[PDB]
């Protein structure tokens, strides 16, 4: 791709102090940061972010939830990062994530679920230019390259 | 309910310095705890715990086993608590839990497998009341609250 | 003796769901949890717990404050574990604890640095039986003893 | 203030996936995330957040070295937070440091010493304002922050 | 047995540190150590290592990679560890390893999956006496060993 | 140098699952493992590792001690390794090493403090030549490199 996928800590995220945690997770498994950003997120970008659910009986709910407090989009790029950073955060619903995850490990309910991710590489592509524009997508090479990936 | 659950650090747990491990997992679910104490348990009140079990042909060999060291009895508070309890506990063969549950990282012998959980809403409510009085569950307003539910 | 000392988690520390942290840092010591309990702890107990302070202008407000949510009352067992617990815990004042401690870890302000441990021998033993009955002290051989001692 | 520190990862850090873990220490402590991008640092940016060096041999060796590669500039908020993020972060050369401080458990270098923190907070000011336009700040009350400070 | 499994950090392991932690999973499950060393591995030894792969197209490709850095074999001894080591290492394939695994922790290539561990008794036997003459496995009584098996 | 030192977990390290702990420290800062075995240390060797205490009193039981369960002798590489390794073991007697020191997080008494490592790089090159012959001693070059010293 080089392939990248968009990761978002939701408000119940900052608020628990979750951040790094979901970092360290990327990063061990050896993926590269390549862009971060602390902001409150607008009723307008969530709408757009979350447009395949804008005909569903929820997503005012879920709009106005997501900009009630500060999140923290990111990007990552390495090998297969879309499929998964899915299996990293977990099922939806916390009860059906298993342990290991970041949802079953740290949370109760499918609406406080700390953490966004792409599900799919078209959306990836579609959300990272959503939130960034191309001048924040920093670009480096990893030195442990060789050792990631063949 | 508030939905509670019984969790039980059993002898080997205690011997293996797990206590806090197994804490501290519930609680970075945020999970609540509500009661906690740690005795040496008796036949008569391990009988009545494993009641269900008092046909079989292990039973006297566990409440033998349960009785030769102390145990950490402890109730946890919140959304789901009881089926992800036994999410987070791993199967009770520690062969069958998938890493990541506290038996599949510390356990290999399902006789020493470290903790018990509650398996129902009914089991919790009749364990929690057998081993603690109501005036050891303790109550409190967890700040967190409105970032773990919704 | 065997050396024992008296933790307790305070108010702030259970909140911040840190008691599994806390013990976990005496196990991994090889320090023996001996007893432990959740309660919500009465103005006579803390003023006697706190008998040296009861001339000091703050003497008040500390003791409404640790009453004003759960605590988590322990006792652990092992060699030196009275200096060896203050050490840990770290110095009064989070901004003079060294990082590693659990105040230096947690903590940012003297009024909430999450636990309270024995300054002396002399005071640990009147802790201990302030706060527990002779029987709720649990008695137990730890396995590993020939490898924690000489 | 309230009191606000600036926390950089410089670009061993980045390579070496300590981000998250950097973020992580302050999370841990209740210090608030209010500002955090990735960016490749200009070289006359650079020699402004360095300025009080610019007179000594080292400088322009520190100022292409810390535009080679991607950083993590981040705002932390909290009580002693400027202080404690110096005590945190561990002594400049990593020999010096204690274990627990970031230095004293991830760096051997002194030139290759992970992060940057603000040593006053006339200097976190100042270096708040130079990395960060006021609309990257972000404002959010801590649910916590009754049990992080009196 | 007593049963006995034979684990190996690859060359990627080596180079991203990962020795330590392939060990603790290990040891925090009450697994014993028997055996341990880091060498380079020759390209005839490698061979008969991977002796049921000699007939396929990416044998002389994997014999180099394997040779190319140094690498840490090792011996566990404990009940099922086999089958147990299979788990926590996780899937062949990193996408389709659980996280809690080592592989779905650390990994993102099959070709960089940072250890390799025994499929069956049989290959472990033969893999331990391959790589390990018997004055290189050392014998001893576990304390914790009552707790960790019935 | 090359600079490197020796480290070896004692027999209570093996006993207690640390090999991997004290491992992961030294890799966590960057340090290369380039020798590493497990063996029944020799009443002559370890007389010969220890011959600057021959005259003192404890000689005989130290002696008696270390070769009464299995070691992990290892070697580290890197700059400041052996000053460094020293800080990160912490004092000889736990009771004056600092937390996140091995011997302050792990050990309570001086004769079960879990992990030798050498005290200046004369006593380095010594032990290093003393525990393993120049074949077992292997050489790479560690990736991250550019990112751990300048």
Known sequence: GPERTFIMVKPDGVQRGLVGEVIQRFERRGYKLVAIKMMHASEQLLQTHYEALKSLSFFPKLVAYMSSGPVVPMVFEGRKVVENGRTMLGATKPEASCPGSIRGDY?????R???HGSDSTESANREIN???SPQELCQYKQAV???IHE
Chains 1, 2, 3, 4, 5, 6 share one sequence.
Do not use: I, M, S
């Open 145 to 147: 390259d060789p050792w």
């Open 107 to 111: 949370c109760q309910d499918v609406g």
């Open 113 to 115: 679920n700390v953490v």
């Open 130 to 132: 959503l939130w960034f």
